[PDB]
Design a protein around this ligand. Sequence first.
Ligand SMILES: *[C@@H]1O[C@H](CO)[C@@H](O)[C@H](O)[C@H]1NC(C)=O
Ligand SMILES: *[C@@H]1O[C@H](CO)[C@@H](O)[C@H](O)[C@H]1NC(C)=O
Ligand SMILES: *[C@@H]1O[C@H](CO)[C@@H](O)[C@H](O)[C@H]1NC(C)=O
Ligand SMILES: *[C@@H]1O[C@H](CO)[C@@H](O)[C@H](O)[C@H]1NC(C)=O
Ligand SMILES: *[C@@H]1O[C@H](CO)[C@@H](O)[C@H](O)[C@H]1NC(C)=O
Ligand SMILES: *[C@@H]1O[C@H](CO)[C@@H](O)[C@H](O)[C@H]1NC(C)=O
Ligand SMILES: *[C@@H]1O[C@H](CO)[C@@H](O)[C@H](O)[C@H]1NC(C)=O
Ligand SMILES: *[C@@H]1O[C@H](CO)[C@@H](O)[C@H](O)[C@H]1NC(C)=O
Lengths: 422, 422, 274, 274, 114, 111, 111, 114
Amino acid sequence: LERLVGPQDATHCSPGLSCRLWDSDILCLPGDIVPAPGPVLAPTHLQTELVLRCQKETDCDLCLRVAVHLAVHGHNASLQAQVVLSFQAYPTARCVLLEVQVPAALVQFGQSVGSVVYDCFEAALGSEVRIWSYTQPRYEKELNHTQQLPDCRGLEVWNSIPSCWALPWLNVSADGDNVHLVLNVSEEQHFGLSLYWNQVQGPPKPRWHKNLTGPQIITLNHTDLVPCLCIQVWPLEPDSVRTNICPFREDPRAHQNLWQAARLRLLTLQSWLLDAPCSLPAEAALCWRAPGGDPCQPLVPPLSWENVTVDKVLEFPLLKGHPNLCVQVNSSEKLQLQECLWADSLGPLKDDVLLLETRGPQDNRSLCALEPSGCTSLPSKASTRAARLGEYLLQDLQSGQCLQLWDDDLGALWACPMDKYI
Amino acid sequence: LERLVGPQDATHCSPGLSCRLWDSDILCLPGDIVPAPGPVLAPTHLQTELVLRCQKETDCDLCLRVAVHLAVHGHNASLQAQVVLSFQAYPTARCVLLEVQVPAALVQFGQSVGSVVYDCFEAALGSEVRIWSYTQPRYEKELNHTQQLPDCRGLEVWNSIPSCWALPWLNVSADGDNVHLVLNVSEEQHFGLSLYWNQVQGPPKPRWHKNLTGPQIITLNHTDLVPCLCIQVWPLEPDSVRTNICPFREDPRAHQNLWQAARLRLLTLQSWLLDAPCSLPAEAALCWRAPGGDPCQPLVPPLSWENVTVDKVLEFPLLKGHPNLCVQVNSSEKLQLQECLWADSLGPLKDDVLLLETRGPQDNRSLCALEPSGCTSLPSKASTRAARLGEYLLQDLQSGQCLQLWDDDLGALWACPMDKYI
Amino acid sequence: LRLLDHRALVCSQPGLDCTVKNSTCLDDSWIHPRNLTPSSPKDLQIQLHFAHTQQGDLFPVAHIEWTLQTDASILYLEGAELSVLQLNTNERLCVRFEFLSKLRHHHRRWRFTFSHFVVDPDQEYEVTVHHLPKPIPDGDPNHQSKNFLVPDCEHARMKVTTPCMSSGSLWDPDITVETLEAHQLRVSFTLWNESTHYQILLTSFPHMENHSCFEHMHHIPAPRPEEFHQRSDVTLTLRNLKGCCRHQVQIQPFFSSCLNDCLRHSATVSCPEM
Amino acid sequence: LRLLDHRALVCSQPGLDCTVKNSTCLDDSWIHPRNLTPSSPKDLQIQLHFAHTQQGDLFPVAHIEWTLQTDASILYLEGAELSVLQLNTNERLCVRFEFLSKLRHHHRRWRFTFSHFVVDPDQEYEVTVHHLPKPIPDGDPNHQSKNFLVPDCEHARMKVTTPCMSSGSLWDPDITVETLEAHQLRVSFTLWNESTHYQILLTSFPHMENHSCFEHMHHIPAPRPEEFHQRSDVTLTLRNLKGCCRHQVQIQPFFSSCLNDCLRHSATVSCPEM
Amino acid sequence: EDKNFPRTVMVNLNIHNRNTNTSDYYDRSTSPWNLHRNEDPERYPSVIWEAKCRHLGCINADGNVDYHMNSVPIQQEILVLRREPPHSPNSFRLEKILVSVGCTCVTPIVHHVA
Amino acid sequence: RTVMVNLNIHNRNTNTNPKRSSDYYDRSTSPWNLHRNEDPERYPSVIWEAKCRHLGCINADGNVDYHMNSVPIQQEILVLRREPPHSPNSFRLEKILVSVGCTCVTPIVHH
Amino acid sequence: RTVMVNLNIHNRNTNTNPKRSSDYYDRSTSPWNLHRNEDPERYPSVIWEAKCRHLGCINADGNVDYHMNSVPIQQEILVLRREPPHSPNSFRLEKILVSVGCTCVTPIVHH
Amino acid sequence: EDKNFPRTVMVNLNIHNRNTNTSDYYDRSTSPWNLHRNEDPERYPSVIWEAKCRHLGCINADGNVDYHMNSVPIQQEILVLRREPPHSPNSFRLEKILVSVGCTCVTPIVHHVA
Ligand SMILES: *[C@@H]1O[C@H](CO)[C@@H](O)[C@H](O)[C@H]1NC(C)=O
Ligand SMILES: *[C@@H]1O[C@H](CO)[C@@H](O)[C@H](O)[C@H]1NC(C)=O
Ligand SMILES: *[C@@H]1O[C@H](CO)[C@@H](O)[C@H](O)[C@H]1NC(C)=O
Ligand SMILES: *[C@@H]1O[C@H](CO)[C@@H](O)[C@H](O)[C@H]1NC(C)=O
Ligand SMILES: *[C@@H]1O[C@H](CO)[C@@H](O)[C@H](O)[C@H]1NC(C)=O
Ligand SMILES: *[C@@H]1O[C@H](CO)[C@@H](O)[C@H](O)[C@H]1NC(C)=O
Ligand SMILES: *[C@@H]1O[C@H](CO)[C@@H](O)[C@H](O)[C@H]1NC(C)=O
Ligand SMILES: *[C@@H]1O[C@H](CO)[C@@H](O)[C@H](O)[C@H]1NC(C)=O
């Protein structure tokens, strides 16, 4: 009746009829189809109910409860019979010895005589068991009821089995400048501990591995902590189950550490990369840093913000590099990196002015100069009172002096030398 | 007949009569004075000849050869008899079984019947042995011939026994600046080596001790080498004999090292000592060293050469010490030491002149000054043209300025200050 | 584990009437014991040997020998179970001695020898000698056990035996491999007189590290009867990327006498600098 | 080495008829042996004890026990030589068991105990149990030997026994020695209830060296019956030359129960600086 | 008839559980194996799990077949009962048989020559 | 309640196949040690139980990889026992769970 | 050529004096180790031979002074032996030189 | 009469020399000892060397009696023959006796209390 049966092995048939059990794993085999010179019992069908056993409060296991209906057939008034249930199933092999004794009242020829129930056939999760029931001595062939069991995947299976999720608690603790791993294992309980950085290819990337006798509150180093940090624990017993918890996926301090460890590196003139431990996608774009000050003005417009991915190589749409060109990386628009790639390749920063070309009205060329306060479309009136040194840079450009950095059907960027004016 | 018998144990009686030996250490005891119902043999006296046994060329031991004369007495024609020689002597205990058979020709009642000789009773040096000879069965009481044996002290005992002096050769080798200990032991022969400095009280004073597997030619250090150096060697076997060889007693290099190591030390104003490793007697006397130069002039006369002995404390016949007084030690008149004792107590060397007083003719006082070229009796004409600065020192002396160093009924020494003349 | 031959394996030696019956390893005395109990077999010892059979083949054989205790219990002695239990498989092997005449007199230490047990090389056994009748339950033991062990084919006297030669001990490949300038490797080896497949196995690593850079296998189907002892050159391309160079190969044979377990013949050539 | 008492030392226990004859340690079977040979005594063990005698004195005693082998040779068993050979003196001690009825049936492991052997404390013995009849020359042994050993009187259960109390274990001197300012040392101690001479032994050394500077003995003749337990003060002058100071003394007793071997009771006081 | 062959003996029938009342390793192993139905109604137990090595080599962490290692079978000798006479559930006769229990991964035998 | 058995065994494993194994307990990625389970009251008297030496498996270099697990292959086998003389039966059939060998397995992970 | 003996021994050392010795082999200046000389053909069957552990003696500090020597005290004692059954006699009396203990002695010096 | 007491046996008489044919230690020892004539014509051997400790303490390198050490005796049990009947050189009876063989120097037993 209940889904929480006791620790003892005993039989309980339907009312009226009396019965007994000898759970001694008796030797059971088919034998032969013997004759029935009188009223003899025989099985009709087999059943498999969902029952659980609990020896103590913190200790529970499965009990596949089985039931066999019998009936009078064949050629004192109390009809007696011996039934068997040969559970030749994986992993263990055990038999059962029932003893049905249906009294005179329920004796009906060609009709049922109640039912018998054994508690229990403890079967493992994910093992298609074999229930072979036959009379003692045998009359009918063993009835096939090859029950398919659920792994740790049944809905009610998770509600009772501790193997399913319930593993010693590791409470999250990102309190202060110390990240604590609070453990709730017993003083005498030993365990294995492993921390690693997961990603797309080559999932394992360990940072710390050790055997411990808990409960030790381990304080983590922010050097090895990033959103990829995952913990795996297991008790020191062979075949013991583990669990992979990756909580730092959206922790603020972990992402702060991720970016300070990430680095930008130029591979070749037309190739660069973002080297970060945790592979988290983010965007990037070229910027123009002034040599005097450092207010880096982004070149958007006319250039585009590229979809960057960690460990994915990208190419520049530039004919040549310039030391004032620096890459800016942002995630959710908040700026993270402003490293100048050509600071070693062509640095230090040159005070060569940058121009933004675009086709003006009447098909003519319309130029502009990148100033700290946006851009100034020149030739034009100047803050220097005269028509600006841009009037002379305009000549340098059409006389082929200026360096073309970016080329497009609609525009172009030019690095013009101002080293002949101060 | 010979003093070099073979390794075998056999009997050889006087000519004519035949005899045999059963050297099986038979059980021998007196028993009782039995009756003689016929002619029976009996002993008259016992003898002990000097015989030596040699199994191989390099292996020889002792053989105390014994002889027993027999005679017919008491109440076929061949008279037979059984004799015993119970050698119950220290250290080992062994018996002998002779078998005398004197034939008819030598049979004379009340007269001798030849003699029997056993080879041999190997007895140790320095053990008063017990020779108890009696008939088998017994008639006469055992004849006493308690022979006193010489230790390794007999004149012929040294000529044959290797225990007496013959010990692995250590050849003396004071060749070059290296003193070699040449050893003649076999390659597989192990031994103990000890070197020490012997003297009057407390003979042992080791310098080097070690176990070695010779023949190693050990080169000695001249730091530990003096006339007291003695060597002791012995094979690595319990109770093995050793020998103490002290050859450096009159070696020139050893005495050279002895004096360079010896030192002179002032104990108190009226006491000093000669500290030397080897206690060898020698003479010493006080000397006067000049502050300018160093030709130390001995104060003999008027002082005496003292009989000095190492480690024997001596006293000075001086009222007070002076830095210019230095002790000179010589052995066979050749000078060895010239250490200035009061160089630390009252030094450095003062240029105060020394005077030698003596009672001149007519009872008057007659003084003299110790110069580099002997002494100059002053007041006198001087090499300084004037009557010398001695004329003024003469006044300083009688006005109590000069320091009296030595006092005698016939003379006196004085240290006068010349620090008021240059 | 097997008898050398079901021949005249009889123990009838001078001053001793008996016969060696091959048994099921479960004497009748184990089932229904007696109040009597014989002595234990003192100083049990086993020694390996090689006896040439009727066919002409040589096999590794176990020679067992022991001495009985000189106590009165030697009279009440029926025989012995010469058990040779292999530990890798727990397979039971044995022979039941049975005395016609019961032992008397003593004077000389009685001794028995048994030169008729074929053993598999490189296997640990436990040679127990159970004197009969077997003791009662809760009774003293009348037996001695010895963990016997057979050495591998690398031993000179083992390599010559039948189980070693069929496994591939005699066989020597003579790997005439060549570092071809075209970034290729010329694998080559002579094969044994047995029709079976051989598979070449490549692995590459840098000159200063145990970690690998590339892996590749190359199959060789069963050679024909005439192709026995023939040289099999199977050249393969090396994806020699600048950095990797210390190539290492092992021809893994698959003879019937072993299969994947077989003796792999390796060859290695380090990175040539200069 | 001696019997506790020549009393009813008989081995007649249930299911066993026998008697323990005191023997010369040389059974008749050693001299004229038999073809039969009994089994060895399995798991021989000895355990020390202390049994109060008729007089009222307590002595250290050796309790020996063992089990017979369940082989058929147990039938042909006459008895045993319970030898207790002391190693310091090679003195032989033993008892000859002799069975009236010969052993049969088995069922339970037969066991014998022997609580009648006085032992001398701090002595190593070798308890051999030779089953009878003794074996033939060039025959297997039917005996087991065990190197038994008795602990010193410093053990709590040994100090209480008779041999320890007479030696001088109970006795405690209570050395009320005093560093007298007159360069003297006031030796003092209480003596045990036994008339014998006690000798004081002085030795002096510097505060930073194991080497000595002076030695001196002082005799004390046998005290009278009333002078038992009395305090014996015997003050002695110290030739305390400046340099030596760490004095050390040991009252060497000379009781009848030991003589020079006896327990010396030492006392030491280091150089007091400041 | 008893006593004709003394090898006939009575047996309790109620098996003494040596804590058999008190796995998925075949699929999780680096040297996996498959089970075959070596069943027989005449032999006890009726159902058997014959395990023979599934892979010739061993499966590495990535799932690849690593040819630097070999999967080897583990066999044992076990006792079983077989009906004597046939189909009579009263008497039996003992039998010793070979069974393949499981597999394990082993390093190969190598002979290194320079 | 009781069954008769003829202990006149028929040795069916007398195949003696060409493949002859070697010492696997040390060669395996999951090494094991063997224990002598000896009992004269039981037949077979001796059974050699193999038990895993390490919790983890051996990597190519030669060290215990704690990220993998060594597990014993436990097999239930049939064995006979001499039932006491006082008890009605003379022999009793028993089932024993014993360790046969070891194998290297990937551990389970619960998300 | 032969003598009769009654082996019915009379134990005369049954004095059991008040002095009871202790383990001297380690306390001595000349330490020794004991060997079990066991022979069932001889009576007494067991004799414990003491042999010097060191060549030198132990000084007050506790070290082997090589300037002194440890020597064994060898005593010749009477013992019986079972003479073979083929030989005319059944028993043979033998004298054996065996090591009893050790003592510290001053070595000899030959000038 | 033989056979009346089976303890009567024949003896070879010719002693088997266990290399007794192939000392001054009493005076050279640090624990010296003196020899006494415990002689008896009825006992075999007739002459005996009873050794008892000469000095109570031990003699040091200087020749002084050092009271920091004790000389102890070494006794043994040896077999000897005694005439049975008396003065009849044909039969004997065994006897076990106590003999003082030699001496050795031992450190005393100490109980150190601060
Ligand atoms: C940590 O513990 C608190 C209770 O103190 C609980 O509310 C919280 O869920 C725990 N967190 C984890 C991850 O177990
Ligand atoms: C974990 O351990 C702490 C120890 O202070 C305790 O307060 C907490 O309740 C424990 N939690 C569990 C789930 O055991
Ligand atoms: C790529 O850039 C576009 C710009 O509109 C943006 O919408 C998108 O989120 C970026 N990231 C990815 C991974 O597509
Ligand atoms: C050293 O050897 C020589 C012979 O070379 C010999 O004449 C001399 O006597 C030896 N000296 C000693 C001390 O043995
Ligand atoms: C000593 O040894 C040397 C080795 O060269 C040898 O020449 C010499 O003759 C030896 N002397 C003696 C006496 O053995
Ligand atoms: C002592 O001095 C005198 C001076 O004449 C001298 O004869 C003697 O040899 C010296 N030495 C000794 C030790 O007497
Ligand atoms: C003994 O060997 C014979 C053949 O030689 C065979 O018939 C018999 O069954 C064998 N018995 C056993 C138990 O091996
Ligand atoms: C046995 O003890 C008795 C006295 O109780 C004594 O007469 C007999 O001589 C003893 N025998 C031996 C060998 O100790």
